[PDB]
Amino acid sequence: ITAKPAKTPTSPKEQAIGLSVTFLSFLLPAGWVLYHLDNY
Amino acid sequence: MFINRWLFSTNHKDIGTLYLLFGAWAGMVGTALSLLIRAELGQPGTLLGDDQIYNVVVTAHAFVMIFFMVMPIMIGGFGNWLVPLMIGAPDMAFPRMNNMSFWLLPPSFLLLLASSMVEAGAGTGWTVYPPLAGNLAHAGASVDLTIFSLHLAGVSSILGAINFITTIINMKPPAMSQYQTPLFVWSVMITAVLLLLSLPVLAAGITMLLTDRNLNTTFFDPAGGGDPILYQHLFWFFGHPEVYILILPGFGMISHIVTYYSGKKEPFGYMGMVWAMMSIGFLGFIVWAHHMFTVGMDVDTRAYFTSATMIIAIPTGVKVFSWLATLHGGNIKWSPAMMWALGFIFLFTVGGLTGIVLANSSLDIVLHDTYYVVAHFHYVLSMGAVFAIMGGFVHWFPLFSGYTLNDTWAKIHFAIMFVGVNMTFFPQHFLGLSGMPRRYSDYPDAYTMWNTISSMGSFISLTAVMLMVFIIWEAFASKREVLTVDLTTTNLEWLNGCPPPYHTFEEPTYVNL
Amino acid sequence: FENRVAEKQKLFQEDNGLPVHLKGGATDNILYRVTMTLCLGGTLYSLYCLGWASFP
Amino acid sequence: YQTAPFDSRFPNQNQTRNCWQNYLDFHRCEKAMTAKGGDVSVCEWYRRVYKSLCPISWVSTWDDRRAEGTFPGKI
Amino acid sequence: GGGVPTDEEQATGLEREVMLAARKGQDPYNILAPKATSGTKEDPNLVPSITNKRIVGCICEEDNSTVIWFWLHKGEAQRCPSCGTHYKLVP
Amino acid sequence: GARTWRFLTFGLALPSVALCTLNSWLHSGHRERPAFIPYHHLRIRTKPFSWGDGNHTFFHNPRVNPLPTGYE
Amino acid sequence: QTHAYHMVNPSPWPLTGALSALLMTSGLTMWFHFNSMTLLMIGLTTNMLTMYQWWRDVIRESTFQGHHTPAVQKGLRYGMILFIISEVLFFTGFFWAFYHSSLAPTPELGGCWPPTGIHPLNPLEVPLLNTSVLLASGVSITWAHHSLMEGDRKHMLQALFITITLGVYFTLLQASEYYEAPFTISDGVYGSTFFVATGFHGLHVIIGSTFLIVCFFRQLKFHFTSNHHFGFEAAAWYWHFVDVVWLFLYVSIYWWGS
Amino acid sequence: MAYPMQLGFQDATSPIMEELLHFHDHTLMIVFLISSLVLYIISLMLTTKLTHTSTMDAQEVETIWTILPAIILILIALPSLRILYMMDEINNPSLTVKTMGHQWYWSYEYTDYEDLSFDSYMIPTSELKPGELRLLEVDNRVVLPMEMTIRMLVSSEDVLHSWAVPSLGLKTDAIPGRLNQTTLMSSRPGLYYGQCSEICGSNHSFMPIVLELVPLKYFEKWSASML
Amino acid sequence: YEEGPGKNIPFSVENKWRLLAMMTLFFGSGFAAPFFIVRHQLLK
Ligand code: HEA
Ligand code: HEA
Ligand SMILES: CCCCC/C=C/C/C=C/C/C=C/C/C=C\CCCC(=O)O[C@H](COC(=O)CCCCCCCCCCCCCCCCC)COP(=O)(O)OCCN
Ligand SMILES: CCCCCC/C=C/CCCCCCCCCC(=O)O[C@H](COC(=O)CCCCCCCCCCCCCCC)COP(=O)(O)OC[C@@H](O)CO
Ligand SMILES: CCCCCC/C=C\CCCCCCCCCC(=O)O[C@H](COC(=O)CCCCCCCCCCCCCCC)COP(=O)(O)OC[C@@H](O)CO
Ligand SMILES: CCCCCCCCCCO[C@@H]1O[C@H](CO)[C@@H](O[C@H]2O[C@H](CO)[C@@H](O)[C@H](O)[C@H]2O)[C@H](O)[C@H]1O
Ligand SMILES: CCCCCCCCCCO[C@@H]1O[C@H](CO)[C@@H](O[C@H]2O[C@H](CO)[C@@H](O)[C@H](O)[C@H]2O)[C@H](O)[C@H]1O
Ligand SMILES: CCCCCCCCCCO[C@@H]1O[C@H](CO)[C@@H](O[C@H]2O[C@H](CO)[C@@H](O)[C@H](O)[C@H]2O)[C@H](O)[C@H]1O
Ligand SMILES: C[C@H](CCC(=O)O)[C@H]1CC[C@H]2[C@@H]3[C@H](O)C[C@@H]4C[C@H](O)CC[C@]4(C)[C@H]3C[C@H](O)[C@]12C
Ligand code: CUA
Ligand code: NA
Ligand SMILES: [Zn+2]
């Protein structure tokens, strides 16, 4: 496949932010429930 | 305009996009349920402290992965996007009915999530066998909400099957015979025929269960002269076709992917591939009682079901060897989609072979209701379906979105997922052979080591899922717009550009005789 | 009865930009609003019922 | 008599009808022997076979229904 | 006993356009498969279009399962990249 | 043709319905109801019905449909 | 476009239909478990409103706007055949339940069919009359079809009126049968198989009769041409399906099962 | 019973389980070979710069691809079905025992001669005697004679259960209103464990089966003591 | 209707950070839901 250069390139730092926010969106809520299973 | 476009759609592409979004969301739910299963099993003892909740989680895991992730993605998503494009059709035959097949699924899912929130849930298994699923052992609304979820899903898929069969038969170019349609289109037509014939039988059976629960019928209640085994026949008469429904569109996508990344104009042995899919579809209706080898049926019945089940390996092997023969002599492009497809061929083969082990009723006595069965279907169904979905998704994402993925990230994603699913499911073969039952919240101490490893594998696949979401974000974030793709002469779905215009084939293709 | 299909053809082919479900006139709008209000209101009521049924 | 022998009438995994038929046969024979004041020892083969094969709860439920007049088999 | 309208009396819209075109032996709505010419440079297949390009699928030989797809542009005749059959667009 | 199917409608089909109507009407008398026996495979009640007192079937006929405890 | 297919206007009815399904199912749940008919009556109302407006729009698109070209009509033919096939398979499940139960009657029944304490209907009385009624309606609908093809308005309307009258007669006879039946849906697997299989059939007779009534009013309003009348064809196919399911019920449940 | 890090079947306690072990060894060799061939061929197709992208004729190779798999399936089915018909063959049992499944325990009935019956419950982890097995012990074991053909009849008084003993090759569903038959023959004395094998609700994981196989003389002494 | 890359979807890709928030809420809500349903059943 061939493509145009990125209109809005995503730098290594921008990727670290997006990856971090993505991982945290999965891990924090599930982590909160699993940590508190005793309280349940 | 936003409500008209996305709630009132009569467009095959927009409806396909709705199905892909729905399915991806369902996949997150299904995955979360799978991790809760493996967390309960990841050390000896109890985690949840409530084995009814464990049983509800197992039940919901299966319904979400089958009815809300695989079928919506393969048939509603790839089917709606690709089938009209691959035959040069301007839309589906019934573009407004198509939209109702989609909009039935959110209500269906809401009924499933209502089942789990009222009373103590439906802790039945996805088989929903009476009397456990009856009004004594599962009093209250949960099982009825599960039945209604399945009615709505069933109507969605029956109307979808009518739409796909009509589209594929009626809306090709007048010169194009059935034997000039791409293999993916064949795979959807065959899948749709299986849905049309199988789902009504499930609908009959679960309706009988509804009436036994609420109208004092006794179809499945021996006190009234009924028989729990009748439910099992009606369920599995649907359920075996259902497992071929889950894989057939996957076989179609694999044929396209292997052909494309081998640099070929065509798959090896086209008419053999059509023959094999039709043979699998037909044989799929005459084998169901291999789900019932321990219920007490007659020896000659067991002999027949063993023998009929083994026959399916012949057309299946023609497809596997044909994929290998499509690679043969290729200018191989090691794209991430090709990696998904090669993973599919191998992992599907492993799971199909453990299916042949299980087909032997004698050995099935010892393997039935063990982790051997769980291992079999997580190879052939879970890995097979998911690997075909991820291959199709990374191959066609640029068509659907107009944007390219980062190929290096997509290869990393593949590598993580390959390790995770094999670490999760391979040890379940040992657990099965050594006698660990399925549908257990805890296990005798001897089974600890392979359960521990399996649960560690489940977290590796979670890391892959999270990375997949980041990879999709990065593609939409960077906005690398597609210009050209190779092999458009034998991949018509690409020839209107990326993404294609809302209306395609307003002027149909010219094909002469 | 008399054949008035030509008069309906003219009505439903009028170049007024209306979608077919509203092209009959003001009565179509009323019936659509009744249908959608019962569907959306009913759905909100079903969610309330879910909330009630989710607890003892 | 050790246990119920193989019966070519009931050669398969489902033995429900074998239990039912011997229960009926015992009670039909018992009624026939009692009605002429004859000898129930003649019914002994059926008694041993149904006692061997039939779940206690099935026997107890069938006995209760015979006493109630709600037993649905013909004796 | 009469009183049922005929298609000639009552068909409308696209149904009527298709009905009237068929009476004239015309196929504006692409219901029929066009018959190939010899496909030489002197006798190209003539591909009607309402615009300046149209997708052609070429079934190069009878009973081929593989169709070869390409855009045919207004201007000089183009050739099927598999069999070299000539096609000419006729706006 | 239409003439042939009308001929079948009036000459065979509707006469058949008239004869079956006469047959039914000649056998329409009320049958003597059988002694009540509280058989456990009949008058099933695993959950109350969602109407009336929970114990009457939807098209309950007092003359011929006994309750679990007998005729009303 | 230079193809003959129908690009449908964006429509709200798919969404209202899907929500009507949620309201009917959540409604049945709330009737069976929470002693309330409210959601169920909203769902039934929205379902009827959705089917009315959706099929009204199909009439507008075809009779009034001309979108049903031969290619579109061909697609609808396939769609209706496939829909009937799905309905055949739904009934097959109920026949399988009937044959499973009746061929291997369990000890709870008395190990016989019909079960101890079941007094079946005489299949030579109202069931035979119902058989003559639906067979006769298959003849009258064929007369209606030929009358329409031959351009005969009066005889099409008379034949279709007779067909509908026979469907209504069947429905009133079956209602009467249900009320007079000395067995109920709660009379074990005999009552279960009888009422669920004949009850889904009776529902399909009411649906089919309703479809014929729509065709009757469209015919009164001159919608059909002598050549173009797919709604009538589909209603006839569906009506023949209802007849054939009855003949299988009659032979299986009423006659062989008595 | 299973032991830690176990890969394969529990050691065979019955002649039919022995047969199943030999049959699994045969079948697994085929599974390994076919799995390995497919992986090898993938690697072969992917490891050459040589190309052939023109249309290939499929007819000749499809004969090999259908005949060879058909032969393999026959070679699996023949021994498979021999064992199936062995496990059905008329045996003269010397003893009949019934088991009834319940939520969540088994009951056993020995009614050939005396009305002996008892219930069999899992020993809770908090009550295990030192060295006893978590989730596997019961209070009342199924005492049976070794080296004798036994008829087991299996049913349920509530939901579906399934009566299993892996080392004897046994799994028979427990269905209310149905009496399912299986044959049991142990070559050895000892304790043989199994677990409920049809989901039956919240305590499915916790209603095990324990057979206690003893010489006939000890079985008779046990039966006589139970009066 | 709007055509072309980023315009054939029911969500905006005009701003990659707003997009990250929407994708986070979308996939996160699905992944979280079973944990919160388990919590709801345990708290009964
Ligand atoms: C994608 C879904 C899918 C697919 C395609 C299959 C495919 C097969 N399945 Fe499986 N199966 C499931 C999903 C699937 N299955 C699920 C979900 C269950 C569990 C349901 C539940 O209980 O919850 C199940 C359970 C199931 C059972 C019941 C086991 C039990 O509960 O005790 C059996 C019994 O025979 C079976 C057999 C097979 C066979 C023989 C095939 C065949 O179609 C496989 C054919 C493929 C090959 C053989 C490999 C390729 C072939 C070659 C390379 C040629 C040469 C090969 C030979 C000569 C052997 N499967
Ligand atoms: C398609 C079907 C499917 C899929 C994909 C899966 C996926 C997984 N399943 Fe399974 N599972 C079943 C079907 C499936 N499952 C069924 C039918 C049962 C039996 C239920 C019963 O007994 O009644 C079962 C049961 C089952 C058990 C046995 C429970 C028991 O017996 O007690 C276990 C145990 O480990 C398990 C684990 C997993 C894990 C860890 C995953 C996954 O975590 C593996 C990794 C895969 C993913 C993480 C999916 C990724 C896909 C997406 C996120 C979609 C992306 C979308 C786009 C790109 C558009 N599942
Ligand atoms: C006259 C000819 C036809 C009449 C039609 C019936 C009238 C009422 C209901 C209509 C819907 C019918 C469909 C079939 C469903 C089940 C039962 C219907 C059969 C019937 O009417 O049976 C009656 C019982 O109804 C009962 O329980 C009550 C029934 C009412 C509640 C039914 C709710 C269940 C709905 C199930 C939904 C399933 C939908 C499937 C969708 C599948 C899509 C994939 C029989 O009366 P009885 O007093 O027991 O015996 C007579 C004694 N004198
Ligand atoms: C008191 C009542 C309680 C019961 C309520 C339940 C519902 C009852 C509904 C009955 C069905 C009515 C269907 C009416 C369809 C009208 C639209 C129609 O018939 O549309 C026709 C197309 O057919 C088409 O779409 C064909 C459309 C096919 C419709 C198929 C309908 C059968 C549906 C069954 C419903 C599901 C049942 C399943 C339950 C288990 C229009 O084309 P023509 O006729 O060629 O006209 C064009 C000419 O005029 C040109 O010259
Ligand atoms: C417990 C209760 C749960 C049940 C919930 C019920 C589920 C959903 C609510 C149903 C709402 C129905 C509303 C009407 C649907 C009409 C569909 C229809 O009639 O669809 C037609 C196509 O299907 C055709 O013909 C042939 C197909 C016609 C099918 C009609 C509808 C069937 C709905 C139920 C079917 C279940 C099947 C039973 C077998 C298991 C028209 O296709 P369109 O794309 O519209 O237009 C195309 C244009 O060219 C026409 O001018
Ligand atoms: C199956 C998918 C799950 C995979 C595992 C997820 C990995 C863990 C992610 C982190 O999750 C968090 O962990 C914190 C602990 O590290 C918790 O803080 C908890 O504990 C803290 C330290 O004890 C306190 O300060 C906080 O108040 C308290 O909520 C917090 O709630 C939770 O969100
Ligand atoms: C246009 C959009 C649609 C909007 C939705 C309309 C919502 C209407 C709310 C009324 O709610 C009702 O309240 C009744 C009284 O509180 C309940 O009666 C029922 O519940 C009673 C509880 O006291 C019981 O006595 C009986 O079962 C019964 O009368 C009934 O369940 C419930 O529906
Ligand atoms: C513009 C939109 C307006 C929407 C208005 C909604 C219409 C219904 C609202 C009232 O709800 C009802 O309330 C009754 C109690 O007051 C319920 O009695 C129910 O409970 C009875 C028990 O006495 C049972 O006989 C029956 O299930 C039933 O009548 C009835 O079921 C339920 O529907
Ligand atoms: C006089 C009128 C003409 C209709 C017309 O051409 O507009 C006739 C033609 C056929 C008639 C119908 C048919 O004769 C069949 C029915 C006969 C019944 O006696 C009255 C209602 C009945 C349904 C009739 C109503 C009405 O009188 C119709 C519609
Ligand atoms: Cu008893 Cu599982
Ligand atoms: Na645990
Ligand atoms: Zn060519």
Author numbering:
A (entry chain Z): 1 to 40
B (entry chain N): 1 to 513
C (entry chain W): 1 to 56
D (entry chain U): 11 to 85
E (entry chain S): 3 to 93
F (entry chain T): 12 to 83
G (entry chain P): 4 to 261
H (entry chain O): 1 to 227
Please quote the paper that reports this structure.
pmcCytochrome c oxidase (CcO), a terminal enzyme of the respiratory chain, catalyzes oxygen (O2) reduction coupled with the proton pump, generating a proton-motive force across the membrane. Mammalian CcO consists of three mitochondrial DNA–coded core subunits (subunits I, II, and III) and at least 10 nuclear DNA–coded peripheral subunits. The electrons from cytochrome c are transferred through CuA in subunit II and heme a in subunit I to the O2 reduction site, which consists of heme a3 and CuB. Cytochrome c oxidase (CcO) catalyzes oxygen (O2) reduction at the heme a3–CuB site in the transmembrane region of the enzyme. It has been proposed that the hydrophobic channel that connects the transmembrane surface of subunit III through subunit I to the heme a3–CuB site is the O2 transfer pathway.
